Amino acid sequence: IKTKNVDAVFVEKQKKILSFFQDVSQLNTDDEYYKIGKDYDIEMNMDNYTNKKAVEEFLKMYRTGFMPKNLEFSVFYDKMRDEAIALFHLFYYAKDFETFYKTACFARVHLNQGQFLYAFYIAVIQRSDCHGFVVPAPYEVYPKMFMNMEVLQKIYVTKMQDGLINPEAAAKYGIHKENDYFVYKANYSNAVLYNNEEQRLTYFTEDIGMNAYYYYFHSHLPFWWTSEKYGALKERRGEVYFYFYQQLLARYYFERLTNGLGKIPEFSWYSPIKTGYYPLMLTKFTPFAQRPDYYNLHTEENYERVRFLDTYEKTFVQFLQKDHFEAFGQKIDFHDPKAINFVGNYWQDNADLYGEEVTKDYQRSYEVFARRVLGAAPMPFDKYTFMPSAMDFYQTSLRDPAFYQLYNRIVEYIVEFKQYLKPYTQDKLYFDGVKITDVKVDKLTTFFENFEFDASNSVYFSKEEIKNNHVHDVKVRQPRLNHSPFNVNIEVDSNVASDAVVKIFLAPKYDDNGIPLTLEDNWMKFFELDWFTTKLTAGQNKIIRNSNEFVIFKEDSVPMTEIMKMLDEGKVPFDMSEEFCYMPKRLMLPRGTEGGFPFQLFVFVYPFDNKGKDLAPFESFVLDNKPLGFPLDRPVVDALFKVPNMYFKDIFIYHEGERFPYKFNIP
Amino acid sequence: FKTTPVDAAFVEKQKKILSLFYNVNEISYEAEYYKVAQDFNIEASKDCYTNMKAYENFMMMYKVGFLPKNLEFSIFYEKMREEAIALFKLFYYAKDFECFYKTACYARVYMNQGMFLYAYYIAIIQRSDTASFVLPAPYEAYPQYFVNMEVKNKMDYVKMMDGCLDEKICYNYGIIKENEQFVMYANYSNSLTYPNNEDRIAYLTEDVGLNAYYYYFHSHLPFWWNSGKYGAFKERRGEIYFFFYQQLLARYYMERLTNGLGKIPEFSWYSPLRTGYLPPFNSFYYPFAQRSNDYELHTEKNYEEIRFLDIYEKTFFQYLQQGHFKAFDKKIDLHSSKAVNFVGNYWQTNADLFEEDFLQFYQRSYEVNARRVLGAAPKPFNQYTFIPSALDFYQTSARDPAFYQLYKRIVQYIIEFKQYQVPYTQEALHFVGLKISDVKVDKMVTFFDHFDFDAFNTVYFSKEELKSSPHGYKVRQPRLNHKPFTVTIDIKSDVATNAVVKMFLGPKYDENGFPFSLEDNWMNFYELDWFVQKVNPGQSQITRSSTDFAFFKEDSLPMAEIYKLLDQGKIPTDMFNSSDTMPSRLMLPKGTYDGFPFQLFVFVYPYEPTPKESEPFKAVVPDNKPFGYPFDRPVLPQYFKQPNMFFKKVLVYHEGELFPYLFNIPHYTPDKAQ
Numbered sequence A: 001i002k003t004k005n006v007d008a009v010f011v012e013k014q015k016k017i018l019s020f021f022q023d024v025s026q027l028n029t030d031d032e033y034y035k036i037g038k039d040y041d042i043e044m045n046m047d048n049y050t051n052k053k054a055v056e057e058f059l060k061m062y063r064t065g066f067m068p069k070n071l072e073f074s075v076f077y078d079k080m081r082d083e084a085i086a087l088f089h090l091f092y093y094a095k096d097f098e099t100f101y102k103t104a105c106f107a108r109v110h111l112n113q114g115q116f117l118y119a120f121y122i123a124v125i126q127r128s129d130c131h132g133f134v135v136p137a138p139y140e141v142y143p144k145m146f147m148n149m150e151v152l153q154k155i156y157v158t159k160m161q162d163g164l165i166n167p168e169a170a171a172k173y174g175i176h177k178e179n180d181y182f183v184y185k186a187n188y189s190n191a192v193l194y195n196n197e198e199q200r201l202t203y204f205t206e207d208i209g210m211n212a213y214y215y216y217f218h219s220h221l222p223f224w225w226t227s228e229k230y231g232a233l234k235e236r237r238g239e240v241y242f243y244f245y246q247q248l249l250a251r252y253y254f255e256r257l258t259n260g261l262g263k264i265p266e267f268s269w270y271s272p273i274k275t276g277y278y279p280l281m282l283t284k285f286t287p288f289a290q291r292p293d294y295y296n297l298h299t300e301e302n303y304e305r306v307r308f309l310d311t312y313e314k315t316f317v318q319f320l321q322k323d324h325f326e327a328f329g330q331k332i333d334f335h336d337p338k339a340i341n342f343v344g345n346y347w348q349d350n351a352d353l354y355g356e357e358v359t360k361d362y363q364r365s366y367e368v369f370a371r372r373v374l375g376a377a378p379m380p381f382d383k384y385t386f387m388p389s390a391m392d393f394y395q396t397s398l399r400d401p402a403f404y405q406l407y408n409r410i411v412e413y414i415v416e417f418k419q420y421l422k423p424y425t426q427d428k429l430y431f432d433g434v435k436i437t438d439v440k441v442d443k444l445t446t447f448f449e450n451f452e453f454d455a456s457n458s459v460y461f462s463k464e465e466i467k468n469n470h471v472h473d474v475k476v477r478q479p480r481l482n483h484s485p486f487n488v489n490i491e492v493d494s495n496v497a498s499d500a501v502v503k504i505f506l507a508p509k510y511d512d513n514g515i516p517l518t519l520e521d522n523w524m525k526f527f528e529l530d531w532f533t534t535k536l537t538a539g540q541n542k543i544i545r546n547s548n549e550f551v552i553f554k555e556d557s558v559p560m561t562e563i564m565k566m567l568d569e570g571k572v573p574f575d576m577s578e579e580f581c582y583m584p585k586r587l588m589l590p591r592g593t594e595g596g597f598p599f600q601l602f603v604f605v606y607p608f609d610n611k612g613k614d615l616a617p618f619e620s621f622v623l624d625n626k627p628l629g630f631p632l633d634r635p636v637v638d639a640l641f642k643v644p645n646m647y648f649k650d651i652f653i654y655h656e657g658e659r660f661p662y663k664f665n666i667p
Numbered sequence B: 001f002k003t004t005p006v007d008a009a010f011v012e013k014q015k016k017i018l019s020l021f022y023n024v025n026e027i028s029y030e031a032e033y034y035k036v037a038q039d040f041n042i043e044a045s046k047d048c049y050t051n052m053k054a055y056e057n058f059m060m061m062y063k064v065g066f067l068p069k070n071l072e073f074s075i076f077y078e079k080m081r082e083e084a085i086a087l088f089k090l091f092y093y094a095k096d097f098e099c100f101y102k103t104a105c106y107a108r109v110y111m112n113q114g115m116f117l118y119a120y121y122i123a124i125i126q127r128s129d130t131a132s133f134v135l136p137a138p139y140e141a142y143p144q145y146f147v148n149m150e151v152k153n154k155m156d157y158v159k160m161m162d163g164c165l166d167e168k169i170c171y172n173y174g175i176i177k178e179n180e181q182f183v184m185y186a187n188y189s190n191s192l193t194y195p196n197n198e199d200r201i202a203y204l205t206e207d208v209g210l211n212a213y214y215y216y217f218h219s220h221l222p223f224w225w226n227s228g229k230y231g232a233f234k235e236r237r238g239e240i241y242f243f244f245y246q247q248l249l250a251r252y253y254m255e256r257l258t259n260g261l262g263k264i265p266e267f268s269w270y271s272p273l274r275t276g277y278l279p280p281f282n283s284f285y286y287p288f289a290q291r292s293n294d295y296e297l298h299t300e301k302n303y304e305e306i307r308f309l310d311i312y313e314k315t316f317f318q319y320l321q322q323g324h325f326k327a328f329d330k331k332i333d334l335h336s337s338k339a340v341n342f343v344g345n346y347w348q349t350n351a352d353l354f355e356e357d358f359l360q361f362y363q364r365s366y367e368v369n370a371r372r373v374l375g376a377a378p379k380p381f382n383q384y385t386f387i388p389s390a391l392d393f394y395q396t397s398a399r400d401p402a403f404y405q406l407y408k409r410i411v412q413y414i415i416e417f418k419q420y421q422v423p424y425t426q427e428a429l430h431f432v433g434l435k436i437s438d439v440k441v442d443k444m445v446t447f448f449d450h451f452d453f454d455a456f457n458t459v460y461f462s463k464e465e466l467k468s469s470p471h472g473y474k475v476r477q478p479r480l481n482h483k484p485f486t487v488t489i490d491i492k493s494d495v496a497t498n499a500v501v502k503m504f505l506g507p508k509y510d511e512n513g514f515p516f517s518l519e520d521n522w523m524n525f526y527e528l529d530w531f532v533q534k535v536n537p538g539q540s541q542i543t544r545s546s547t548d549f550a551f552f553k554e555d556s557l558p559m560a561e562i563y564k565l566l567d568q569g570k571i572p573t574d575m576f577n578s579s580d581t582m583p584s585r586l587m588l589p590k591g592t593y594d595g596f597p598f599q600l601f602v603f604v605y606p607y608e609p610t611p612k613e614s615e616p617f618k619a620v621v622p623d624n625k626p627f628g629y630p631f632d633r634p635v636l637p638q639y640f641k642q643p644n645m646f647f648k649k650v651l652v653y654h655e656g657e658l659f660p661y662l663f664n665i666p667h668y669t670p671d672k673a674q
């Protein structure tokens, strides 16, 4: 739908990129990438990389040996990570497109496909020549990680059988051929297993968009890499960390509310953890590890891990006990809101915490080991051989209740810091002579709709079938949440011509007992929907803002084949070219109820720095230096806070149509 | 609002019965009951009783002394039980109403308040001449157990100030003068009394009628009383036990469902009980015992009781594993009819399980011990002074979540045994030449309503004030409620027959949004109603109004209103015929604006009468059929597709405010249902 135009030169480059996301598990020896790949000599091309040191390091490490082709790559393990990072450096410091391309061809040919794709996807994102380029949605690149094993197996069965043996029989199982695609209907995990109440939320926690979303978040801004590239953004890194989780968690909490599930559970490393996770997914070697209910974190195997983790926390508790201290070669003062940077970087243990370009093995990650122990897997066999859990991958992390429980813990500690900050005062927040006299919102209505994604990358083909470009294409379809578009009409009385910023937040109305929600202690349950600017004339004004224009969300990724068609028309998708790392639009609202679950909308209008000139979106945010999530980035005091340029509207989220996703999947 | 006529002899006798419930916490030295009590010579009254051994027994315990006034009385403690049973026997064996009344005036004056009330309530229910007389509602007799301590306290203060400091200020604290009487608005409890998700349903479990209902259950057939009075009912006693709890838990699980709460959790005596509760009550000496979340059941104080409890259940397992076994001086087969009765009496440790006319102190009871461990109190100081939990009274038991945990545990055990019963076959259930073609219901709507009762019995009055039988002090609280609706049933019959029409209500979906299958749902249905229709051949339509449902009743009238009705020769006919059933208020679980989905199950079968039971209880179908038939046992769901069966999906809506608190806000006018 929303597109953008592109010259034949961009087209050739884009198709070259996408060729690496096409048949990922296998090698076409006839194909151009293979000829290039097989014999390409990095050493002879040394002067075609910006950074000799990087390439040397790569050749060293590579001649030493990388991970093998049959294993499962995860970034959370040292040696694999380092291999990946070196490969990435290689892609990144390539002189030009051509060399980068030749470098990929090599790596595709010579290396573990998981490692390669991790590296490449990030390089494409992070390279400056490649800004403007497009990467396929992660569920197409790694489809095996966006579906339960039931479906995956059905796919393999159908392929072994070279088609359906009894079409009518297959239809009972949600399998049918549609033109030259085989289509699998896919149920969420709780259609087959309801082990605890968390399964109530599967349509969210398993939603291929939510998971892809987290995968983008990491890809844009990996914990091991410095934010150097982004210049000024670097000094805000910590801020972005906290914001991302605090937002995600708020959105998650909304889902919880509408399923009658309340606040996110706390755990202790010295105690068993009540909430299990039974992953219904596997790998060519092993199944993902399961965590039974009341799994005891404190066993022989974890004793040392727990020590480390306990210390990592106690250390931050000590920071909170002083207000000003020296850590990691910086001098920190918790009265300073800019210290959020340090705090965010502390918890993520990222490159910017130290002054470095990449993290080092001895700089041990709290998140890595939290994930590792929460994951409940047995100890890895060797460095390349471990039992995967959902927290070994960004594609799968959102699937485990424990994920939210972990980041909840971290975020909470970060707000323990936020308490140091002076609450915004009356006269910091006032917009003199402007008043929001009314807010009116359209119908807020959620629903489910079937969605298909191309899952072909999961299918293995034959020597003979590959040269024949024989087609066995696979689509997986499942109900995914969506909502109807809606308008927010804001009526404001500006005394005077002024330029304003309008901000829109969604928040809960009551807690799960009907206690109405007070800002004083519920400010962090506010989810930001929109940020925009408006000319405000004297007298009466009215802004109309449509949920499609909301800046914080994106449209669904277009499939590769569709992107591929658009390229022949000098076209490319807009949203995928620029706006990929945002939350998908359909998920903005939690699942409402047939009778209208109560939330509230917080509209806030405040003075914009004129510019004296015309305005464009991206730099317009950077010109006003308000902290992310303003004015709800720190504790509020209700009475000191409320003001005429604020408005709170009680709203109701309805749901229409079929309420349970499995009803779509009925034979 | 329905009544029954009554003559002057009744009125005068009735008034005499009620007079003893005035200012129960004190003595009016000017009252008639006081003159009668003074005049009554207990040592010279051997001739007032039809059972001289019972009188001798009383006089013996009496010569040594009873529980002193001002201590808490509980049926769950041995000596107090013996004394109370003894008092009751005197009440019961009094030869005459005049002897009964003198004895009651005596105990009213000279014995512990709680003991006396306990036995007097029971005696009235039990005595031949006195049944058919009305009793004040349990919450008007025992306000202390039906009023949370915020309000109870406000009442103390208001009485001490003889009104309000300044009328506007205590309008803000929810206190009102209305017609020369006080009204205090009362909210349901915080998370400082229900410190977990269980709070979502305080409006059910603190509900005064629900609690009354359980107290009435106990009082109609005390565990310590044999069945002799009810003759052939003796055979069906254990069967009631299951039906009462199964049924109650079904009603309770429906509330869970609409509050997103899911299945009542299991527990273990060797582990901590997750789900605590802080009773909002205090006795004369003690605040009630608190049970915090994650309370360790297994500690020194409770070890020996846990040993008891554990074997008590495990021997039931041994009885299941054998199938025939000699136990309690009977030879008992679990394929037998008598089995259901045994099972029930076993779990309740009835007087019937043994020889006993009246239960022997020394026969240790699983329910008694269970309530001590789950109540979490310190061990009693001496045998007249113990530290009360909610599990110490039938008035307060339904308040503690651990109560439903206990009785669900019992009910499951009996369901485990129910595997030994033979599932109903096809022709067994099939009504020949009778089909339900359609069922149709009116809109099912829950909503909230303020409700008043007088709590004066927990408030103290002056020497002077007591002369007027003073009762100023009322509690107004929002209680669940629904609108009347009618079910219409479309029937086609080959023949004229007589049919029983039963209709039940139960759940539609899992917490997972899956349809419940009958093999797993049968225990979750509760009976709404049964009746007998003469059914004509051809097509007919039976209508039934929620007003006429057999299992529910109108609210009790306050004692004031009872008197105002006697003055014109009447009594409230529900308080007369059926004081022991669920209030109709609580018929439906709280709905949603959506409509919450449940199944109404309608069932028609051939009426085959048997000689009327003389009933301790809810008049049930004059049938050889079990209680709660055809849901009295596990089913084979095939056999439940019969033409004389109908499962109809039904949605319960709600109207006006969604939470009771929105009604007790000063200066806020709520959305009331229309």
Ligand SMILES: *[C@@H]1O[C@H](CO)[C@@H](O[C@@H]2O[C@H](CO)[C@@H](O[C@@H]3O[C@H](CO[C@H]4O[C@H](CO)[C@@H](O)[C@H](O)[C@@H]4O)[C@@H](O)[C@H](O[C@H]4O[C@H](CO)[C@@H](O)[C@H](O)[C@@H]4O)[C@@H]3O)[C@H](O)[C@H]2NC(C)=O)[C@H](O)[C@H]1NC(C)=O
Pocket (backbone or CB within 6 Å): B064, B065, B066, B067, B068
């Ligand atoms: C502070 O705390 C102390 C200790 O707990 C309390 O002391 C107790 O006081 C109560 C009275 O309130 C005592 O109980 C009563 O006292 C008499 C006991 O008599 C003793 O001696 C006789 C021989 O003469 C023995 O038979 C007997 O075993 C005793 O050892 C009785 O006369 C009382 O009987 C009266 O009341 C009963 C019901 O209680 C009636 O049935 C009778 O008709 C009669 O009226 C009664 O038994 C108790 O003995 C004291 N405990 C101790 C350890 O000494 C204080 O009361 C308390 N102070 C305050 C302000 O609370």
Ligand SMILES: *[C@@H]1O[C@H](CO)[C@@H](O[C@@H]2O[C@H](CO)[C@@H](O[C@@H]3O[C@H](CO[C@H]4O[C@H](CO)[C@@H](O)[C@H](O)[C@@H]4O)[C@@H](O)[C@H](O[C@H]4O[C@H](CO)[C@@H](O)[C@H](O)[C@@H]4O)[C@@H]3O)[C@H](O)[C@H]2NC(C)=O)[C@H](O)[C@H]1NC(C)=O
Pocket (backbone or CB within 6 Å): A515, A516, B172, B173, B174, B185, B186, B187, B661, B662, B664, B665, B666
């Ligand atoms: C059952 O339980 C419910 C739920 O808890 C109780 O309802 C609460 O009741 C109290 C009244 O007792 C309510 O408190 C009052 O709030 C009013 C609404 O205020 C709004 O506007 C004001 C400015 O006027 C803002 O400050 C505020 O943020 C709101 O935006 C106030 O007008 C009242 O004013 C009083 O304030 C001071 C005390 O600080 C007094 O000295 C004054 O004289 C004046 O009376 C008051 O503060 C509260 O809103 C209710 N809670 C909920 C969740 O709705 C019921 O009271 C309770 N019933 C019983 C019998 O216990």
Ligand code: NA
Pocket (backbone or CB within 6 Å): A264, A265, A266, A267, A404, A405, A406, A408, A409
């Ligand atoms: Na947590």
Ligand code: NA
Pocket (backbone or CB within 6 Å): B377, B378, B379, B380, B381, B385, B386, B387, B388
């Ligand atoms: Na005690």
Ligand code: NA
Pocket (backbone or CB within 6 Å): B264, B265, B400, B401, B402, B404, B405
């Ligand atoms: Na419970």
